[PDB]
Amino acid sequence: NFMLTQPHSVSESPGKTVTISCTGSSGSIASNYVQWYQQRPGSAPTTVIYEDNQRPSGVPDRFSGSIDSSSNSASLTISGLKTEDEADYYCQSYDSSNHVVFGGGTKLTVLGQPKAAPSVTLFPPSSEELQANKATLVCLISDFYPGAVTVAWKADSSPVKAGVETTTPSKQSNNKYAASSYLSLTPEQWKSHRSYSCQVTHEGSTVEKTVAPT
Amino acid sequence: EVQLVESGGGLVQPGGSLRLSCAASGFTFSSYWMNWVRQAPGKGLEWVANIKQDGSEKYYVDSVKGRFTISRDNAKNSLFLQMNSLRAEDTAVYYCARVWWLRGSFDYWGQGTLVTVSSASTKGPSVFPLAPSSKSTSGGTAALGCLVKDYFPEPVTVSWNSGALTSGVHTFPAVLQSSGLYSLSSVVTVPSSSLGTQTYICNVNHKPSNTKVDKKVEPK
Amino acid sequence: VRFPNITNLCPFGEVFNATRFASVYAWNRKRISNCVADYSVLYNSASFSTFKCYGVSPTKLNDLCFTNVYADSFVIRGDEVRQIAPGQTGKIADYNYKLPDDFTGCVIAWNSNNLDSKGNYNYLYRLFRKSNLKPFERDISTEIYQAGSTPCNGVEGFNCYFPLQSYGFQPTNVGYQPYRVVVLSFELLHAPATVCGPKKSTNLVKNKCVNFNFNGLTGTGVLTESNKKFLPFQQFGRDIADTTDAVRDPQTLEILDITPCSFGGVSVITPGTNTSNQVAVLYQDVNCTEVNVFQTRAGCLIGAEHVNNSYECDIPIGAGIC
Amino acid sequence: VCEFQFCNDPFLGVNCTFEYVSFKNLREFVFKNIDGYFKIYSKHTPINLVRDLPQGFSALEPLVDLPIGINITRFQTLLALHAYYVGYLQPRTFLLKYNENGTITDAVDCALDPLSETKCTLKSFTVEKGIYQTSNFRVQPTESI
Ligand SMILES: *[C@@H]1O[C@H](CO)[C@@H](O[C@@H]2O[C@H](CO)[C@@H](O[C@@H]3O[C@H](CO)[C@@H](O)[C@H](O)[C@@H]3O)[C@H](O)[C@H]2NC(C)=O)[C@H](O)[C@H]1NC(C)=O
Ligand SMILES: *[C@@H]1O[C@H](CO)[C@@H](O)[C@H](O)[C@H]1NC(C)=O
Ligand SMILES: *[C@@H]1O[C@H](CO)[C@@H](O)[C@H](O)[C@H]1NC(C)=O
Ligand SMILES: *[C@@H]1O[C@H](CO)[C@@H](O)[C@H](O)[C@H]1NC(C)=O
Ligand SMILES: *[C@@H]1O[C@H](CO)[C@@H](O)[C@H](O)[C@H]1NC(C)=O
Ligand SMILES: *[C@@H]1O[C@H](CO)[C@@H](O)[C@H](O)[C@H]1NC(C)=O
Ligand SMILES: *[C@@H]1O[C@H](CO)[C@@H](O)[C@H](O)[C@H]1NC(C)=O
Ligand SMILES: *[C@@H]1O[C@H](CO)[C@@H](O)[C@H](O)[C@H]1NC(C)=O
């Protein structure tokens, strides 16, 4: 069925223009109308752009967009970025295979402060937990900016998805963001691999930590 | 002036059911399309169901097909969603919205009603120390923390040395496990040289079960 | 607000629910004119896979008037539906059905694989042409296309091709499945508009002060049944001083007299304040149903007790009343 | 309203942007083109005059009002083969008399003669004995010195 996808981390300096894109697959995005929504933390998403290039009252002319039909994609641009524009942005379109289709969302950060790479520390199961027949590995990410990172777990050289839960970035006391991820293994699973690791992606480069049974 | 008001959220067991409602005014219901849109915590938006202006036809996303029923009453000025056989995967915030035409935009949105699906009973947390390895310690700086696991419901508050240690301290958001229980963690940032000389005890407080756990974290 | 019965709808259904469509190289056109354009059967329909307006939003379209509306229909592959748009190029956009960059209208399409397939080679498209098409042109000639330098002399051969190629539409083909495409082109000329969307009417409430809009006239007042009749073609009546007297209702064809909403001066009837602070109030030339209540010719008098006994006049009210 | 090809002597035997399909006899019509609309008024009455145009008064009710948009400078009357009259309208003032049922029963042509001017000036089909001022006279310049 037709689906929409979006980039996770999008950021730009205040006063400048940022582009937020959305792409389609298993159908044509340009065969129907594309909407864009903005969800500020704490409330519901509201319409910013509709029917490709229209906007509701209360939305300034800083918000505009278009559909690139030959690339099966669409985007909006936000000029004159303000610190009030921090929000989760969403794309929406219509299909026959899937009536209303929403994208996964884009996290937009306005860079009103210096950027920072994440500090990642990966902790092994303690003896107390192993004695309870559990082996949760804990990946803690802190001190990063913009507040948007991707966190994933691996077993040896292959990715592991089972038993994985994540949180979103959350502003900490130093105005940077922190995030976490948990991998819940049994001791037997933990010891079935040479090692386990957590890799955190920020912009493009990554930070990777490894722990193992001893 | 158009407004949407929602209710009917709360905690339900797996396999259970409930009805959500979205009361509204400022428009005639029979002139507009009504929809439900779902958003799980940490997730983006997805569509659940759509009902036609006069209630003559209904549409659903495959993931809720055969389980959820969308219905409306244009005389009572309210939209309803009957959700049967709720699964753990259905934990989410449910929004109602007004649509001018089928392939148009969602012009008005509610605030969102949270539905949590869990068989878990109220339980206090177990706390396990998270010790840094020598590989990270050797860098000159280090971090150590606590894992708070298998508690229900939220929230849990965590502090270090009974509130004495606030510098370099962060408590992470909790996650919901497939077991219906929650887990979170807390970390304190230290100089690597302080790991073997200073005391680092986390104080984990879970009000719903009157449980307090004091756990010392040491380096590996 | 009252508008007449709509007994003349635009035949969008005839175009969309047709048993057969034309080939794209020979696309059909039907003129829509002198009718009510109800688009609620097009934009509220979930059966369409494509629904995009390059002219005006559907939310406004159903309230706009045009001189002419044209419905252009044809069958093409699903992978070619994206070519039916202004600014596009390709085998269909250039040789079969071209829309102008400034196209004003809507492109609607849906899957027809459940009917228009076998292989079904009845539908054709132009593969070769000497030049591209002008906006809304059509070319149904069979002249052999010369790709090379050797004259074709009416037949196929080395670098000579029949200009058309058929579609291999089969029930087992998404991109190669047939789609029915209808393009609705809307224009406004210097001529009087002939096609407007439907207008909604409200219920009519009698014997109340209301605002109103009947067909093309507006005003305020009270609508009551008239005891007068109009000629068969007349829409409303007018008074001596050129004010609206009555209106003929667009749906019932009954005639309703229009009166002004009650108004008049308000005066206070009082004994001198030296002896009393009690007062009565007279509403001039109004009914007591509109405002010790006494209805008289002067108006509606409240606070004064009417009595049978006559007395020499003291404070005059009017029409014999003191 | 198609771009019809016609003979130079069209008769009946014994693209269109508009299409519609449905002596003793006096038929009267008025054809006028206002802001693109072709308005047709008509009346059909019995007569007992077989030689010439009957004398009398009637008003023609509107028949159709067609949103056509065509320039009309000339027209052709079509007869079937095995009488009619044509006049032209002018932007003149008339006083129209409406009876109790709203039917026009009489009329005054306000520029026909001095009595008609008085009748229009006074808004009455009956004029009392006396003198009425109906218009002003002004001699116009005929040359330039
Ligand atoms: C082209 O023709 C089709 C019919 O093949 C039209 O489909 C119409 O679809 C609507 C649903 O959106 C039908 O309404 C439903 O009717 C049933 C039975 O009375 C009722 O139980 C439902 O609650 C609902 O009211 C409608 O009946 C159906 N039309 C016909 C004649 O069956 C389609 O709208 C046509 N397209 C155009 C542009 O005219
Ligand atoms: C309009 O439709 C109603 C039926 O709903 C009918 O009674 C009425 O006579 C119709 N009016 C006209 C002018 O056709
Ligand atoms: C008016 O009031 C005065 C008292 O100030 C009183 O003496 C006089 O009689 C009153 N006049 C009348 C007509 O009652
Ligand atoms: C006032 O309205 C009533 C109807 O409720 C009517 O019988 C009465 O004659 C009216 N009186 C006047 C003065 O209009
Ligand atoms: C006048 O007298 C008649 C009886 O003859 C009575 O019905 C009526 O109500 C009286 N009117 C007033 C104002 O007292
Ligand atoms: C229809 O109108 C166009 C534009 O004026 C004209 O070129 C065409 O020849 C007309 N159709 C016919 C059959 O003459
Ligand atoms: C007659 O033709 C002129 C252009 O030469 C046009 O402006 C005018 O509106 C036309 N008259 C009618 C009734 O269409
Ligand atoms: C008005 O019409 C009636 C028939 O309903 C007729 O008897 C009457 O004479 C007409 N009035 C006039 C002034 O012609």
Residues 6+ positions from B200 with CB-CB distance below 8 Å? B144, B160, B161, B165, B188, B190, B216, B217, B218
Query: How do strand B182-191 and strand B141-151 relate by DSSP bridges?
Result: antiparallel
The parent domain of residue C18 ranges over 7-118+171-198
Same domain, C23 and C143: no
Q: Which residues 6+ apart lie within 8 Å of B25 measured at CB?
A: B2, B3, B77
Torsion of CA D104, D110, D111, D116, to 10 degrees: 100
Q: What is the resolution of this structure in A?
A: 3.3
Same domain, C31 and C81: yes
Whether residues C178 and C72 fall in one domain = yes
> How many angstroms is it from D98 CA to the middle of ligand 1?
52
CA distance C173 to C116: 12
C42, C51, C52: which to substitute to probe chain A, counting the most A Cβ within 10 Å?
C52
**Which ranges in chain D belong to alpha helices (H)?**
114-121
Query: C202: Cβ below 6 Å to ligand 4?
Result: no
Strand B157-160 vs strand B201-206: parallel, antiparallel, or unpaired?
antiparallel
Q: How far apart are CA A28 and CA C179, in angstroms?
A: 14
Closest residue by CA, ligand 6 atom 12 = D15
Structure-token pair, residue B30: 């029979």
Please indicate, yes or no, whether residues C111 and C135 belong to a single structural domain of this protein: no
Residue A61, judged by CB atoms within 10 A of its CB (0-12, 13-18, 19+), counts as: exposed
3-state secondary structure of A129: helix
CA separation (Å) from C37 to C4, C8, C34, C168, C200?
15, 9, 9, 36, 13
Give the A:B interface size as CB pairs under 8 Å: 138
Picking from A33, A90, A134, the nearest residue to B44 by CB comes out as: A90
Report residue A18 as tokens. Answer: 């940022």
Let me know whether C35 and C108 are in one domain.
Answer: yes
Q: Specify whether C94 is located in the same domain as C65.
A: yes
Do C157 and C175 lie in one domain? The reply is no
Token pair for B125: 């947390």
Neighbours of A208 (CB within 10 A): 13
Q: Are residues C45 and C177 in the same domain?
A: yes
Residue C283 three-state SS: strand
State whether D67 and C191 contact (CB < 8 Å).
yes
Closest-CA residue of B relative to C40 is B101
Q: Does domain A119-211 have CATH number 2.60.40.10?
A: yes
Cβ of residue C43 closer than 8 Å to a chain B Cβ = yes
Closest to A93 in 3D by CA, of A185, A3, A206: A3
CB B75 within 8 A of CB B64: no
Residue with tokens 């354009």: C37
C107-146 b/e (C-beta count within 10 Å ≥ 16 → b): bbbbbbbeebbeebeebbbbbbbeeebeebebbeeeebbb
Regarding whether C64 and C51 lie in a shared domain, the answer is yes
Contacts of D80 (CB under 8 A, 6+ apart): D11, D12, D13, D14
Tell me if C204 sits within 8 A of C214, measured CB to CB: no
Q: Are strands C35-36 and C195-196 parallel, antiparallel or unpaired?
A: parallel
Residues C254 and C247: their CA atoms lie apart, in Å, by 9
Rounded (10°) CA dihedral C139, C143, C148, C150: -160
Stretch(es) of chain A classified as CATH 2.60.40.10: 3-110, 119-211
- What is the length of chain A? 214
Closest residue by CA, ligand 4 atom 11: C287
Hunting for tokens 């669409």 — which residue is that? Answer: A74
Contact criterion met (CB < 8 Å) for C58 and B104: yes
Which atom of ligand 4 is least distant from the CA of C300?
Answer: 13
Only one residue has tokens 């007297």, namely: C245
In this complex, do C230 and D62 lie within 8 Å of one another by their Cβ atoms? no
Please report which ligand is nearest the Cα atom of C271. 3
Ligand 4 atom 14 nearest Cα: C287
B and A adjacent (3 or more CB pairs under 8 angstroms)? yes
The Cα C42–Cα C29 span in angstroms is 18
Q: Which ligand is nearest to the CA of C182?
A: 1
Alpha helix positions (H), chain C: 12-16, 58-61, 91-95
Q: Are residues C86 and C146 in the same domain?
A: no
Note whether C192 and C104 are same-domain residues. yes
CA distance D69 to C121: 43
Query: Which C residues, 50 through 69, put their C-beta within 8 Å of a C-beta on chain A?
Result: 50-52, 57
Q: Quote the minimal CA–CA distance from A64 to chain C in Å.
A: 17
Same domain, C104 and C149: no
Domains of chain B, CATH where assigned: 3-117 (2.60.40.10), 126-216 (2.60.40.10)
Out of C47, C52, C88, the one facing A31 most closely (by C-beta) is C52
Contact B101 C45 (CB under 8 A): no
Domain at A3-110: CATH code: 2.60.40.10
Q: Using DSSP bridges, classify how beta strands D25-34 and D37-46 pair: parallel, antiparallel or unpaired.
A: antiparallel
